[PDB]
Enzyme design. Structure first.
Site, PDB file in Angstrom:
ATOM      1  N   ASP A 142     -30.650 -11.534 -94.483  1.00 36.17           N
ATOM      2  CA  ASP A 142     -30.742 -12.551 -93.448  1.00 36.17           C
ATOM      3  C   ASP A 142     -32.076 -12.447 -92.713  1.00 36.17           C
ATOM      4  O   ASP A 142     -32.248 -11.596 -91.838  1.00 36.17           O
ATOM      5  CB  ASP A 142     -29.584 -12.357 -92.470  1.00 36.17           C
ATOM      6  CG  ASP A 142     -29.468 -13.478 -91.474  1.00 36.17           C
ATOM      7  OD1 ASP A 142     -30.405 -14.304 -91.377  1.00 36.17           O
ATOM      8  OD2 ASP A 142     -28.432 -13.521 -90.783  1.00 36.17           O
ATOM      9  N   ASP A 153     -33.098 -20.182 -89.525  1.00 33.68           N
ATOM     10  CA  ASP A 153     -32.176 -19.048 -89.614  1.00 33.68           C
ATOM     11  C   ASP A 153     -31.373 -19.336 -90.878  1.00 33.68           C
ATOM     12  O   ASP A 153     -30.475 -20.178 -90.874  1.00 33.68           O
ATOM     13  CB  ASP A 153     -31.254 -19.024 -88.387  1.00 33.68           C
ATOM     14  CG  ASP A 153     -30.434 -17.751 -88.293  1.00 33.68           C
ATOM     15  OD1 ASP A 153     -30.402 -16.985 -89.276  1.00 33.68           O
ATOM     16  OD2 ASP A 153     -29.815 -17.519 -87.237  1.00 33.68           O
ATOM     17  N   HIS A 222     -24.233 -21.145 -84.501  1.00 35.48           N
ATOM     18  CA  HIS A 222     -24.824 -21.368 -83.194  1.00 35.48           C
ATOM     19  C   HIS A 222     -25.927 -22.413 -83.192  1.00 35.48           C
ATOM     20  O   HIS A 222     -26.574 -22.663 -84.213  1.00 35.48           O
ATOM     21  CB  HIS A 222     -25.399 -20.055 -82.692  1.00 35.48           C
ATOM     22  CG  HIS A 222     -26.391 -19.450 -83.634  1.00 35.48           C
ATOM     23  ND1 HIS A 222     -27.742 -19.723 -83.576  1.00 35.48           N
ATOM     24  CD2 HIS A 222     -26.219 -18.629 -84.696  1.00 35.48           C
ATOM     25  CE1 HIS A 222     -28.358 -19.095 -84.561  1.00 35.48           C
ATOM     26  NE2 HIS A 222     -27.457 -18.424 -85.255  1.00 35.48           N
ATOM     27  N   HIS A 230     -30.436 -18.385 -80.190  1.00 38.38           N
ATOM     28  CA  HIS A 230     -29.088 -18.689 -79.704  1.00 38.38           C
ATOM     29  C   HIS A 230     -29.210 -19.543 -78.447  1.00 38.38           C
ATOM     30  O   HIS A 230     -29.244 -19.022 -77.330  1.00 38.38           O
ATOM     31  CB  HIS A 230     -28.321 -17.400 -79.389  1.00 38.38           C
ATOM     32  CG  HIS A 230     -27.967 -16.600 -80.602  1.00 38.38           C
ATOM     33  ND1 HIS A 230     -27.483 -15.311 -80.528  1.00 38.38           N
ATOM     34  CD2 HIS A 230     -28.034 -16.900 -81.921  1.00 38.38           C
ATOM     35  CE1 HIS A 230     -27.272 -14.850 -81.748  1.00 38.38           C
ATOM     36  NE2 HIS A 230     -27.597 -15.797 -82.611  1.00 38.38           N
ATOM     37  N   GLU A 255     -23.357 -20.646 -90.250  1.00 35.50           N
ATOM     38  CA  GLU A 255     -23.168 -19.394 -90.967  1.00 35.50           C
ATOM     39  C   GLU A 255     -21.715 -18.974 -90.942  1.00 35.50           C
ATOM     40  O   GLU A 255     -21.007 -19.177 -89.955  1.00 35.50           O
ATOM     41  CB  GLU A 255     -24.048 -18.278 -90.379  1.00 35.50           C
ATOM     42  CG  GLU A 255     -23.837 -17.965 -88.903  1.00 35.50           C
ATOM     43  CD  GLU A 255     -24.869 -16.971 -88.347  1.00 35.50           C
ATOM     44  OE1 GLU A 255     -25.447 -17.260 -87.279  1.00 35.50           O
ATOM     45  OE2 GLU A 255     -25.101 -15.903 -88.963  1.00 35.50           O
ATOM     46  N   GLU A 350     -25.891 -18.699 -94.858  1.00 37.67           N
ATOM     47  CA  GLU A 350     -26.310 -19.436 -93.687  1.00 37.67           C
ATOM     48  C   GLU A 350     -27.448 -20.418 -93.919  1.00 37.67           C
ATOM     49  O   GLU A 350     -28.370 -20.165 -94.698  1.00 37.67           O
ATOM     50  CB  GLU A 350     -26.685 -18.426 -92.594  1.00 37.67           C
ATOM     51  CG  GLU A 350     -27.252 -19.018 -91.321  1.00 37.67           C
ATOM     52  CD  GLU A 350     -27.627 -17.946 -90.309  1.00 37.67           C
ATOM     53  OE1 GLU A 350     -28.062 -16.851 -90.731  1.00 37.67           O
ATOM     54  OE2 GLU A 350     -27.508 -18.202 -89.095  1.00 37.67           O
TER      55      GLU A 350
END
Ligand SMILES: Cc1ccc(NNC(=O)[C@@H](O)[C@H](N)CC2CCCCC2)cc1
Ligand SMILES: [Mn+2]
Ligand SMILES: [Mn+2]
Length: 369
Positions: A142, A153, A222, A230, A255, A350
């Site tokens: 990740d 992300d 998120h 975030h 994710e 994700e």
């Protein structure tokens, strides 16, 4: 232009025009009534609105392309026998080159997570870690990139033993279901419910034991903000969440995590991830070492996450106490590894999606996942 086998050519040099490739564009999901949204990718009012933020979308794309090429390269050489440090250094060196790292204007969004087995996230080796990737290991790669704070992300799972195939498939399907359900005005709790339905529809067998894949309930997706991985909203992967709605112009990280354990994670092992609290403002500090360390963080990371290795490479030495002070002062927040019960396996997938006025773009989608 053209990329050299071992990626080395920065992305912006492969697209001199300054226009980067779009991700997968989809029509927003129809409403419960049966109302379609194909009108968005048509309405002149939305079109201008979307075009008005083109530079932003474009920056996300530049970062996504970098992410796609870095991960493809990684998937070609990641193998058992290598240390986690060798893996993270090789990946990050390529990432720094393709994103054309430039201070806070372009670089790595966060450290390279490579959580193993029962650990599902937030693990990246610190100096001295002798951990070696094994044949039966299930590693969650990740990592992220960004241009002007527009963060990508995106994550996938690595395995070498076929016994985990259906487990990976389940989580991949769950992440894709979450991506399809997402949309303007869609309720977050509905996304989480849908994701869990797909996830639990899978059953797997590993070394003689069967399991109904469980989504990790205390982990989640998120919303994303500039320099803020975030932003504030959360995307559950189990039912019973917030009825809060996703809105136009928002960016999300979809994710999901599947596990053969309890489907719950807890802090475990030495902490490696750290990130400055976005809401905390300037704080005067006299303590010499703590002052210098905070300055270094503001200069090199801002509100972007970082790890100890990134402090080491900057020549910083014996900073642990200063870092602890910053954490105790609530200036920096630590993000230790999140692991399920011993012996359990966890997988992750994700993507970052853009809720454009005209459509839904899975900006980080590749021909791989
Ligand atoms: C409970 C919960 C679980 C996950 C999330 N978001 N996502 C993540 O943490 C990962 O996908 C990020 N790439 C890693 C990163 C996120 C910011 C803090 C350091 C580590 C937010 C809350
Ligand atoms: Mn991630
Ligand atoms: Mn994330």
């Amino acid at each position: 232009k053209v990329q050299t086998d071992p990626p080395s050519v920065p992305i912006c040099d492969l697209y001199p025009n300054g226009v980067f490739p779009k991700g997968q564009e989809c029509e927003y999901p129809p409403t419960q009534d049966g109302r379609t949204a194909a009108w968005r990718t048509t309405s002149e009012e939305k079109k201008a609105l979307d075009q008005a933020s083109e530079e932003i979308w474009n920056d996300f794309r530049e970062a996504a392309e970098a992410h796609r090429q870095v991960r493809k390269y990684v998937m070609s050489w990641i193998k058992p026998g290598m240390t986690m440090i060798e893996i993270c250094e090789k990946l990050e060196d390529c990432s720094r080159k393709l994103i054309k790292e430039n201070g806070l204007n372009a670089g790595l969004a966060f450290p390279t997570g490579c959580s193993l087995n029962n650990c599902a996230a937030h693990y990246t080796p610190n100096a001295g870690d002798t951990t070696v990737l094994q044949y039966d290991d299930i590693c969650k790669i990740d990592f992220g990139t960004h241009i002007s704070g527009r963060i990508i992300d995106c994550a996938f799972t690595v395995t070498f033993n076929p016994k985990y195939d259906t487990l990976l498939k389940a989580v991949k399907d769950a992440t894709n279901t979450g991506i399809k359900c997402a949309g303007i005005d869609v309720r977050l709790c509905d996304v989480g419910e849908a994701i869990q339905e797909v996830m639990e529809s899978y059953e797997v067998e590993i070394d003689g034991k069967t399991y109904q894949v469980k989504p990790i309930r205390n982990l989640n997706g998120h919303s994303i903000g500039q320099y803020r991985i975030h932003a504030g909203k959360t995307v559950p992967i189990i039912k019973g969440g917030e009825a809060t709605r996703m809105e136009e112009g928002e960016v999300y990280a979809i994710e999901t995590f599947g596990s053969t354990g309890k489907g719950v994670v807890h802090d475990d092992m030495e902490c490696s991830h750290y990130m400055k609290n976005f809401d905390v403002g300037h704080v005067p500090i006299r303590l010499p070492r703590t002052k210098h360390l905070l300055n270094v963080i503001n200069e090199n990371f801002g509100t972007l996450a970082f790890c100890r290795r990134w402090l080491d490479r900057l020549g910083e030495s014996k900073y642990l106490m200063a870092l602890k002070n910053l954490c105790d002062l609530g200036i920096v927040d630590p993000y230790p590894p999140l692991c399920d019960i011993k012996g359990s396996y966890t997988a992750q997938f994700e993507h970052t999606i853009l809720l454009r006025p005209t459509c839904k773009e899975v900006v980080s989608r590749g021909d791989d996942y």
